[PDB]
């Protein structure tokens, strides 16, 4: 296995809570597919008549185009659409979850054929949540060992998602904040992931969608709000992050016309945010950073929104803790020697931090870097005066880039150890 | 963001 070989045939797979990012090291950007599968059950004979036999026999479809093909036909898709990693962990005995993960592992390899004889298998590098227990590592290794009989696979390794971000950013000493649909992971990196400093929050992009849905109902779009794809489009289009929420709300109630907006959902369907509710745009961006505001609590009191802790194995995911407090807690839980190395660089990653400021709104609205700096200046002025905060260039692709760098560089002489939790396995 | 300048490459290649 030469150096040139590894620059062609390293293959990265990032298993996100809502999207899998995947493909060879030679791609300029990864491909993406939703982390879900559709079971084909209870279908009318009218519909089943025109489905290929091999697909009907399999009874489970993955791939965005393919799931879209059959979604209209399934009447009850809450029961039949399975999301195996919606909180980052597939439970040990959840057989449907692990079947969907194996099908996704198969589909992603199947998108990249062979046409060069000096190829003898991929070198696969998989990224999983820092929340993943030991049994998840074993089950993922098992999936790729089984698929090695269907595809040429030379070697396989696994690493945690926050470490991959640090590698992609060329940052050996830092604090990573990685936020997707399901949760936020906060972890210090000093030549390795410092486990004792991991802090997890039970909020993500799903919470921004949840409050968008409730705003839409209040405006009068309850029927639209029942469609998850539509809530997602509205969230991305109209969400705003305040510099400081109370100041942003006062501005939008004094001059609501600055903040009214419209969203086209289809050639026929359009949504309008009117004057009375224009200020609520700031709730959609704020909720991931800090949910402790009366205007958010109002929906909780109505039993229309949940903000709560969760427990997965040995880790508690905190519902209410704000992002700044999580950074400060993470540092407190590691030694002073490590703190002095990593506290200089805070790095935000993941799609939940993608927010942009519309032209003209710089007085009241913020991007994620600014919102986090404001929070740190309030809760720890000393830290704030010495730290640099940044957002990765491609928020959804950073983990995958670090996975392919890791797979390229990790020595092939380093065999997997259950004790150190690093190394290669060879099918 | 190039591989040649990435300090992690030397760190990872040193592992035994
Ligand atoms: N432009 C955007 N504005 C706001 N949120 C976004 C944007 N793009 C993506 N997102 C959100 O990012 C999340 C996806 O993050 P991602 O990094 O793929 O991790 P995961 O697969 O764990 O969800 C989703 O909740 C999605 O709605």
């Amino acid at each position: 296995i030469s150096d040139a070989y590894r620059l062609k045939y390293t293959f990265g797979v990032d298993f996100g809570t809502s999207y899998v990012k995947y493909g060879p090291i030679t791609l300029n950007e990864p491909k993406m597919v939703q982390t879900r599968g559709l079971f084909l059950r209870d279908l009318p004979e009218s519909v089943k008549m025109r489905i290929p036999p091999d697909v009907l026999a399999r009874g489970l479809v993955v791939g965005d185009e393919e799931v879209r093909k059959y979604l209209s036909s399934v009447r009850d898709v809450q029961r039949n659409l399975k999301y195996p990693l919606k909180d980052g962990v597939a439970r040990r005995d959840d057989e449907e979850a692990w079947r969907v993960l194996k099908e996704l592992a198969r589909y992603t390899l199947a998108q990249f054929p062979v046409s060069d004889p000096e190829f003898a298998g991929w070198l696969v590098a998989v990224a999983l949540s820092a929340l993943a227990p030991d049994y998840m590592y074993k089950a993922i290794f098992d999936i790729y060992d089984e698929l090695a009989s269907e595809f040429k696979i030379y070697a396989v390794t696994i690493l945690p998602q926050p470490l991959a971000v640090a590698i992609a950013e060329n940052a050996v000493n830092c604090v990573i904040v990685e936020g997707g649909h399901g949760n936020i992971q906060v972890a210090p990196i000093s030549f390795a992931l410092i486990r004792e400093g991991l802090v997890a929050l039970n909020r993500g992009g799903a919470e921004a969608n949840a409050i968008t849905r409730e705003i839409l109902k209040d405006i009068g779009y309850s029927d639209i709000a029942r469609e998850e794809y539509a809530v997602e489009v509205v969230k991305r289009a109209v969400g705003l992050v305040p510099r400081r929420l109370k100041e942003a709300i006062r501005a939008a109630k004094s001059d609501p016309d600055r903040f009214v907006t419209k969203v086209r959902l289809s050639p026929v369907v359009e949504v309008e945010i009117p004057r009375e509710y224009a200020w609520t745009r700031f709730l959609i961006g704020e909720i991931v950073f800090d949910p402790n505001h009366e205007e958010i609590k109002s929906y909780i009191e109505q039993s229309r929104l949940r903000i709560e802790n969760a427990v997965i194995g040995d880790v508690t995911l905190y519902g209410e803790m704000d992002v700044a407090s999580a950074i400060i807690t993470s540092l407190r839980n590691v030694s002073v020697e490590i703190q002095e190395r990593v506290a200089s660089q805070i790095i935000l990653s993941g799609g939940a931090f993608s927010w942009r400021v519309p032209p003209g709104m710089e007085d009241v609205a913020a991007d994620s870097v600014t919102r986090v700096k404001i929070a740190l200046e309030e809760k720890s002025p000393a830290l704030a005066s010495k730290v640099e905060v940044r957002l990765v260039s491609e928020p959804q692709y950073s983990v995958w880039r670090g996975a392919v760098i890791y797979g390229y560089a990790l020595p092939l002489s380093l065999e997997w150890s259950d004790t150190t939790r690093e190394g290669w396995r060879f099918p | 963001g190039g591989i040649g300048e990435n300090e992690w490459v030397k760190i990872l290649r040193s592992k035994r």
Side-chain angles (χ1 to χ4, degrees):
Chain A
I1 306 298
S2 75
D3 185 72
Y5 187 97
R6 303 181 70 175
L7 293 170
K8 291 194 208 176
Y9 296 130
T10 302
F11 195 100
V13 189
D14 173 24
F15 281 99
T17 69
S18 71
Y19 273 97
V20 183
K21 299 82 171 175
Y22 68 100
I25 187 164
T26 53
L27 299 186
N28 297 314
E29 301 85 18
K31 295 183 99 84
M32 290 206 291
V33 59
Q34 285 199 52
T35 318
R36 71 186 184 167
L38 176 65
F39 290 93
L40 301 177
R41 290 189 280 246
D42 304 313
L43 296 160
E45 184 217 336
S46 178
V47 179
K48 286 183 158 182
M49 264 186 162
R50 282 151 240 300
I51 298 178
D54 279 336
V55 172
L56 206 48
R58 201 165 62 245
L60 171 63
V61 175
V62 301
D64 290 344
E65 272 196 35
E66 301 76 359
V67 168
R68 278 191 252 119
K69 186 176 169 89
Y70 301 108
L71 252 188
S72 59
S73 301
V74 191
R75 209 190 296 261
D76 169 19
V77 291
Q78 303 187 270
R79 176 185 245 242
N80 294 314
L81 245 193
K82 177 71 175 180
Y83 294 82
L85 298 178
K86 55 175 161 55
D87 66 12
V89 176
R91 298 311 184 271
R92 192 198 237 104
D93 299 331
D94 188 340
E95 302 180 80
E96 289 198 339
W98 286 105
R99 182 158 176 230
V100 173
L101 288 170
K102 181 163 183 183
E103 218 53 77
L104 288 166
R106 182 177 283 125
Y107 174 92
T108 51
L109 285 167
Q111 307 310 119
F112 295 96
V114 200
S115 76
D116 266 304
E118 295 218 74
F119 168 82
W122 299 105
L123 299 99
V124 179
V126 179
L128 304 178
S129 180
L131 298 169
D134 286 4
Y135 73 74
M136 257 189 81
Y137 274 67
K138 177 164 183 174
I140 288 286
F141 275 132
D142 288 351
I143 280 170
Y144 282 99
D145 194 73
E146 295 156 9
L147 292 175
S149 65
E150 305 175 30
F151 302 91
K152 294 188 160 205
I153 301 171
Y154 180 81
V156 184
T157 192
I158 307 176
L159 80 159
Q161 287 167 334
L163 177 66
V165 178
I167 294 170
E169 285 292 306
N170 193 22
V172 182
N173 286 291
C174 61
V175 180
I176 300 302
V177 184
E178 161 68 21
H181 181 264
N183 48 60
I184 302 155
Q185 305 168 65
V186 183
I189 308 294
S190 188
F191 304 90
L193 192 155
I194 309 298
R195 296 183 177 206
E196 295 74 16
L198 177 68
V199 176
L201 308 179
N202 199 28
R203 303 189 308 284
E207 275 55 56
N209 283 25
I211 197 155
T212 300
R213 186 186 184 183
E214 297 312 314
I215 291 166
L216 283 168
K217 295 155 63 177
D218 282 1
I219 291 165
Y221 294 114
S222 301
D223 286 347
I224 280 177
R226 304 195 333 109
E227 286 184 275
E228 265 169 337
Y229 97 85
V231 173
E232 174 73 18
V233 173
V234 174
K235 178 273 292 281
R236 296 189 188 207
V238 317
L240 295 172
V241 185
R243 290 179 65 98
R244 303 203 307 152
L245 184 65
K246 288 191 182 176
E247 303 210 56
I249 292 179
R250 182 180 65 259
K253 291 193 170 157
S254 301
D255 192 7
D257 287 342
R258 286 184 61 200
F259 302 101
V260 294
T261 193
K262 302 188 174 176
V263 189
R264 184 170 168 283
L265 295 174
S266 85
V268 176
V269 182
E270 188 181 32
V271 162
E272 302 171 7
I273 307 303
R275 285 185 165 179
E276 178 179 9
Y277 289 95
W279 64 271
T280 68
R281 293 176 65 182
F282 288 104
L283 302 181
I284 298 168
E286 174 72 351
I287 189 160
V288 175
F289 297 94
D290 186 352
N292 306 292
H293 301 291
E294 188 59 55
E295 297 85 355
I296 295 175
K297 182 190 183 203
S298 173
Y299 291 109
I300 303 176
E301 293 162 1
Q302 296 177 66
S303 297
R304 294 169 60 182
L305 184 69
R306 295 180 72 74
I307 297 287
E308 56 185 4
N309 293 353
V311 179
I312 304 177
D314 253 271
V315 24
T316 295
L317 294 85
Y318 294 98
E320 293 178 2
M321 183 185 294
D322 66 90
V323 164
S325 295
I327 291 160
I328 291 156
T329 296
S330 178
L331 290 167
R332 291 214 200 280
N333 290 346
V334 301
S335 68
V336 180
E337 196 198 358
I338 294 178
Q339 296 178 47
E340 297 285 346
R341 292 193 229 148
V342 305
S344 167
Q345 297 284 351
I346 296 174
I347 297 173
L348 313 183
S349 188
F353 296 121
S354 300
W355 301 106
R356 294 200 186 199
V357 173
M361 289 191 182
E362 298 80 19
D363 58 322
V364 290
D367 70 4
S368 296
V369 166
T370 294
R371 176 65 182 90
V372 166
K373 285 158 79 106
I374 286 171
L376 290 172
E377 286 171 355
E378 293 172 359
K379 298 179 181 289
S380 189
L383 181 62
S385 73
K386 301 147 167 166
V387 72
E388 178 181 353
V389 183
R390 66 201 206 238
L391 178 69
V392 300
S393 182
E394 279 170 318
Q396 290 187 273
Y397 303 159
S398 182
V399 173
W400 172 88
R401 292 190 191 285
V404 298
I405 294 171
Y406 186 84
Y408 165 76
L410 194 72
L412 289 171
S413 56
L414 191 75
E415 312 211 274
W416 175 265
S417 159
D418 279 345
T419 281
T420 63
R421 296 281 121 184
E422 64 184 10
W424 293 98
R425 277 151 116 101
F426 304 95
Chain B
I3 306 193
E5 64 204 342
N6 191 307
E7 300 179 342
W8 281 100
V9 173
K10 186 165 175 182
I11 290 164
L12 294 168
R13 288 179 168 164
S14 297
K15 289 185 171 277
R16 298 295 182 266

